[PDB]
């Protein structure tokens, strides 16, 4: 029963329940002295029983007693039990000290074991350590001297903070923590700002995107916790998914796009047919504007194979490759075949590179290789200049004719229905079938037009080449997008479902390039709302399943 600000008092409902019990007990004791009718004493005993059961468990016997504010009083069983109960709110989970939280940005310069920590957050989190070091090295006589020096934010406080955070790991967490990769240990690097800088390669483990996400930071205190963070929870140790064994640090988005662009092959590029002494001269030719990234050349490659038994065989040969492939080989660790690089590198190819490096070299080489891969991918994706424009969405000319044919055939089958040849259900089913076929054919035509181009080769004729369209490169590399999304952008949106589940007959014959009209957008909303609400409910269902399994 405590005083609040403004003179008001705050109490627990247990006080009211206990007061009721005591009042009824005293009344019963009084009624057994002033000898009373048996009916009155019986009623009072009924009161006493009801009050005790209300105190122990309100609502089980019957109508739950409410307070002056007209909601049921909370009993001891309610204190003990439930999602809000002591077991789950305060015993199985707690609020902890030496913890902070902030928005997360991206640090592309970081190493896999590093995270950017703001200076003010580090000053607040490591305050006792700073006090200890100031007292130890003598600039603070007492603890208020150290507190005043930290509050005034002197320079020597900053050097002390650097020395305390020099090799003290911190724990980064993002909610929801679906698996153990949702909490990992990093070495902090003090940065100016208020946002935590996160290594890109760990985002897939955190399911983290930089659209407003917040992360929590915890400081392990004792030596055992520090060594657990360094040995077990550190980001370099957790690179394999415990669910399947596959690497979880596989590159994505700009890294994949850059490695794809640098390893692509162009016909009649500048510097074709040149002979290069090795990857270094390929780099020199690219930097001197002698040859393009996509020139077909012959390069001398020295390749070392580490066999299963540990045999290391080194041998050199001349290989027909591309300048970008050799420049990428420059960062590949020794012990790997060159066939892993001599191709256009999509997401699967880079994942295979990392998996092979881990299988045949180990862990340290794998983390160094991953860091270099991400640096190179970022650099050459920046250098590529890949951009999206309205002209990158080429709508095939066959789409209009296919729509006209489908509409004419739909008119024909409507005529057949009006003659009684076919029933309504048959008409519905085959109209659905014809629109599905039309959608598939329009998608195929748009893919065929988008995926190829004609170029002039050295000898002068015309040759077929894989396209360098920005959207096509985005989809094929595996960075972002799949065939369905390009179909929606430059083909047809297709059949959409009524909220009950039925599929409307007429599809949306428009993509997002020419734009939908009012009714097409309304049908689109019909399914968009369903998807969003389904996600909202399925999240809770999955969480409850995971709890039960745990």
């Amino acid at each position: 029963l405590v005083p609040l600000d403004g003179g008001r008092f705050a109490t627990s409902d247990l006080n009211d329940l206990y007061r009721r019990v005591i009042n009824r007990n005293n009344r019963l004791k009084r009624l057994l002295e002033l000898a009373a009718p048996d009916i009155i004493v019986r009623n009072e005993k009924r009161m006493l029983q009801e009050s005790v059961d209300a105190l122990l468990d309100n609502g089980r016997r019957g109508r739950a007693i409410t307070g002056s504010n007209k909601r049921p009083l909370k009993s001891l069983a309610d204190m003990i039990k439930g999602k809000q109960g002591r077991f789950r709110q305060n015993l199985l989970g707690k609020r902890v000290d030496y913890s902070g939280r902030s928005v997360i940005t991206v640090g592309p310069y970081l190493r896999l074991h590093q995270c950017g920590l703001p200076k003010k957050m580090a000053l607040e989190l490591f305050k006792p350590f700073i006090y200890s070091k100031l007292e130890t090295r003598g600039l603070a006589t007492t603890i208020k001297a150290a507190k005043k020096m930290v509050e005034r934010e002197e320079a020597v406080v900053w050097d002390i903070l650097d020395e305390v955070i020099r090799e003290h790991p911190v724990l980064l967490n993002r909610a929801p923590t679906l698996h153990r990769l949702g909490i990992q240990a990093f070495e902090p690097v003090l940065i100016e700002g208020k946002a935590i800088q996160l290594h890109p390669l760990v985002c897939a483990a955190y399911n983290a995107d930089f659209d407003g996400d917040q992360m929590a930071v915890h400081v392990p205190l004792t030596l055992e916790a520090q060594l657990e963070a360094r040995t077990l929870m550190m980001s370099t140790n957790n690179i394999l998914s415990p669910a399947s064994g596959d690497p979880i640090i596989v590159p994505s988005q700009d890294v994949v796009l850059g490695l794809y662009y640098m390893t692509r092959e162009k016909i009649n590029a500048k510097g074709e047919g040149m002979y290069l002494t090795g990857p270094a001269e390929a780099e020199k030719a690219y930097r001197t504007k002698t040859a393009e990234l996509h020139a077909r050349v012959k390069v001398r490659i020295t390749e070392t194979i580490k066999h299963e038994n540990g045999k290391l065989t080194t041998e050199t040969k001349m290989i027909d490759t591309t300048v970008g492939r050799a420049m990428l080989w420059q960062i590949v660790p020794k012990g790997l075949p060159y066939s892993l690089v001599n191709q256009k590198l999509g997401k699967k190819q880079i994942s295979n590179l990392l998996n092979e490096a881990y299988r045949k070299l180990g862990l340290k080489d794998t983390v160094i290789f991953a860091d270099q891969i991400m640096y190179t991918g970022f650099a050459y994706a920046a250098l590529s200049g890949v951009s999206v424009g309205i002209d990158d969405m080429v709508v095939p000319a066959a789409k209009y004719t296919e729509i006209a044919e489908a509409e004419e055939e739909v008119r024909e089958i409507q005529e057949q229905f009006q003659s009684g040849l076919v029933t309504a259900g048959e008409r519905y089913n085959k109209v659905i079938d014809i629109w599905a076929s039309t959608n598939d054919r329009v998608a195929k035509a748009m893919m065929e037009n988008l995926s190829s181009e004609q170029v002039i080769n050295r000898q002068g004729e015309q040759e077929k080449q894989e396209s360098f369209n920005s959207i096509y490169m985005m989809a094929d590399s595996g960075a972002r997008g799949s065939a369905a999304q390009i179909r929606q952008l430059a083909g047809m949106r297709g059949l959409m479902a009524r909220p009950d589940g039925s599929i409307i007959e007429t599809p949306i014959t428009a993509n997002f390039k020419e734009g939908l009209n009012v009714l097409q957008y309304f049908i689109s909303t019909h399914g968009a709302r369903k998807g969003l609400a389904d996600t909202a409910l399925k999240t809770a269902n999955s969480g409850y399943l995971t709890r039960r399994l745990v």
Binding site: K538, N541, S542, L545, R548, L549
Partner: peptide, 16 residues
Amino acid sequence: GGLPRVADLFEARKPK
């Protein structure tokens, strides 16, 4: 039909 199936399977439900 994917998550409810797994949930029904792990609780060893009786089919209707």
